[model samples]
Target chain A: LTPEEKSAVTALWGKVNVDEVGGEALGRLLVVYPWTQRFFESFGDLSTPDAVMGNPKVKAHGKKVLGAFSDGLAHLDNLKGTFATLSELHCDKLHVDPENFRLLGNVLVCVLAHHFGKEFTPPVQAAYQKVVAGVANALAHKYH
Target chain B: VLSPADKTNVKAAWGKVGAHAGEYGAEALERMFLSFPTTKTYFPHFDLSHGSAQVKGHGKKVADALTNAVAHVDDMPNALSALSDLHAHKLRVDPVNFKLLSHCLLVTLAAHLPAEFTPAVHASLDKFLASVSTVLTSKYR
Candidate 1:
C-alpha cells in the first residue's frame, strides 16, 4: 500500500478500537450469516441478532477474534505468520469454509463503514477493503 | 479440593507459563497426541506430527482456553461450561480426552515450572485439573 493509504488505514483503525466494536461487528455478521452461529455452542439461542449480541460468550469470543485482527494490524511485518497460524486452526482443525473467510472480510468492511460513517470516505473504504482482502487471502492460502 | 494457598500457587505458576502459552500449549498437545493417538481421530484433518502448524495452533488455542479459565477461577463452572458442552454435545469428544489432556498439561506445567513445582504444587494442580475434567465431562454423564 502507498504511504498515504497506510497512514489512513492505520489512523482509521486506531480510532475504531476493535476491542469495543468487535462484538457488535460480529453481531452484524451473525445477522447476515446466521448459519455461522452454529459454530458457537456458547451462543445458546442465536435465533436473532439481538440474542447473539446479548450473549456474554458471543461478546467475549468476538472480542478475542477481533483483537487478533487488531494485533495483526499492529504487527504488519508478522501478519503473514499470524494469518498462517489462524488458517491452520480454522481450516485444518475447525474446517471452516474458505467462502466464510471472504464473507467475514466483507462483513468487517461493512462494520467499519457503519461505525466510521463520514470518516469512512471512498478512499478510506478502499484502503480498508484492500487490507481486509489481504487478510482473507492470507487465511485462505492453504486451501488453494 | 485445593486450599486457598494452593490456588494462589497454581495461579502464580500459570502466570509464568501463560506468557508463552502458544509454545507450551503446543508442547502439551504434542505430548497428549503422542501418548494417546486416539485423540487424533477426533481431529482427522489436523496434522498431529511434531512441528506441524495445526498441532501448534490448536495447542495454542487450548492453552489460551486454559489460561482464560484460570483467570476466571471464581466463575470457573460458568466460564468452562460452554467449552464442556461444545466438546461433549457438538464434538462428541470422549470424556477420556480431558483426562489425557490434563495429564499432558501437568507435564507441561512441571517442565515449565521446575523450581516451583513442589510436591504441594503438583497435588494442588492435579486436584484443580481433576475439577476441570469433571466439569468438562459432566455433560457426558
Candidate 2:
C-alpha cells in the first residue's frame, strides 16, 4: 500500500476503539456466522444472537482481534515476519485454516463500513482491503 | 427429489469421488475455509491448516454425509432427519454458510474432477446440495 493509502487507513482506524467497535465486530462474526461459536464454547451460552453479542468474553476477544489489527496497521511492510507467531498459533496451535484470517479481515472491514459509512469512502475501503489482506496473508504465512 | 438425469449425473459424479472422498472432502473443506473464512467457526476443534489431519477426519465425516445423501436422494429429509436436527438445533449453523460450503464443495470437485464435473453435473450437484441445506435448516422455524 502507498504511504497515502496507509495514512488513509490509519486515519480512519484511529476513530475506532477496541473497547467499543472491536467487540461489536467480533460478536457480529459469531452472530452472523453462528457456527463460529464452537471456538467460544467456554465463552458461555452463545445459544442466541443476543447471548453471543452480550457476552463479555466475546467483547474481550474482539478487542484482542482489533488490537492485532492495530499491530498490523503499525507494521504493514513487515506483516509476514511480524505476524509469524500469530501464523503459528493459528496454524499449528489453533489448527485454524488459513482462511479465517481472511474471513476476519472481511468482518473487520464490514464493521468499519457499518460504523464509518460515509467516511469510509470507496477509496478508503480499497486501501483497507489491501491492508487487511496483507495482515491476513501475514497471519496465514505459516501454511506455505 | 432428483429427476432421472440428475440422479445419473449426481451418482456418476459421486462415483468419481468414491474412494477418494476423503481427499476430495478435505480439499473441499480447505477450499471452503480459504474462500469463506466464516465457515471455520463450526470446526473450532479441527486444525483448518493445509493438510490438517483433523480436517481430513472431519472431511471424511462430511464426505460420508454426502454419500448418505446420495444413497437417499429420493428421501433426503428422512435420511438426514437426525443430522438435520443436529445442525439446526445443536450446531446452529447459519443457513447462509451452507451455500458457502456447497459452492466450495463444487469448486473442489471441479478442480479435481473436471472430466466428470460437467456443467450438467455441476447443476445437478448444486440442486442436491441446496436440498440438503434446506433439509438441515428446515427445522429452524
Candidate 3:
C-alpha cells in the first residue's frame, strides 16, 4: 500500500460502527452464502434469509466476529503472531475450512461499503481488503 | 468508471502488445516480489526462483484475467463478478496487493513497450486497473 493508502485507512479507523453493523454483516453472509449455515446450525431458526437476518445468535456472534476483526486492524503486520490462538481454535478445534473465514471478512466489507456509502472510496476499500484478508490468512495459519 | 476513450486506449494498446501479456504478467509479479519482498508472503508455497515454471504458471492466470478484463472492459461489474467472489472468498487475497501488482505491471509495460506506451495510455491503463480493483473489492452490492 502507498503511504496515502495507509493514511486512508488510519483516517477511516476513527469512524467505524461496531456491534450492530458487524451483526448485519454476518447475517448477510449466512443469507448470501447459505452453505455456511451448516456451521451455525446451533444458532436456531435460520430457515431462511429473514430468519438468519433476525436471529439473536447471529447478532451475538457477529459482535465477537467484529471484535476479532478489530484485533486484526490493530496488528495488521503481525497477524500470525496475534491470531495464533484463533488459528488453533478455528482450524484445529472447530475444524472450520479456512474458506469460511474469507466469507466472513468479505461480508463485513460489504457492510462497511453499504453503511459508509460514498465515504468508502476505492482506495480505502482496497486498504480494508488488505486488513481483512490479513485476518483471514492469519486465522488460517494453522493449515500451513 | 472509465470513459469510452479510456476503454479504447486500453484495448488498442493491449492489441499492440499482443501475445506477450503472459510474459509481462510474470515479469511484473517477479518485480513486485523483488521490490516489495513483503508481498511474497502470499505465495508461501510457490517456488519464487527466477524464471520458475510456477511463477509463469501463476502469471498465465493473471494474463488470462487481464485479457478477459479487456474483452469486457465496459462491463467490469459483471465482467469480474465471479472473480470478486473467488478472490474475496476462496483466495483470501488483499485487494491492496492488486495495486502492488498493478504498479509492477505498468513498469513492465513501460519497460518493454517503450515506443507505444505513451503518457495518455499510461493514464488510461491505470484507470482501468483501478476499476478492476474496485469491482474485485466490491461485495455489498
Q: How high is the DockQ of candidate 3?
A: 0.03
Better-scoring candidate (DockQ), 1 or 3: 3
Candidate 1 lDDT over residue span A1-144, tens digit each: 667778888989878877668787777667676545546766676766678778777777779988888877865545567789887787666766555566677888888888888989999988877787777777766642
Ranking according to TM-score, highest score first = 2, 3, 1
- Tens-place lDDT digits, model 3, residues B91-113: 65555567888899888888987
Candidate 1's TM-score: 0.49
| Ranked candidates, highest lDDT first | 2, 3, 1
* Pairs that clash in candidate 1: none
- Tens digit per residue, CA lDDT, model 3, A4-96: 766887788778767888789899988887656656768999877888999999999988988777756666668899998988787545646
Better of 1 and 2 by DockQ: 2
What's model 1's overall lDDT? 0.76
TM-score of chain A of 2: 0.94
- Give model 2's DockQ, 2 decimals: 0.20
Residue B28 C-alpha lDDT in model 3? 90
**Docking band of candidate 1:** incorrect
Off by over 4 Å in 2: B1-3, B12-64, B75-77, B85-141
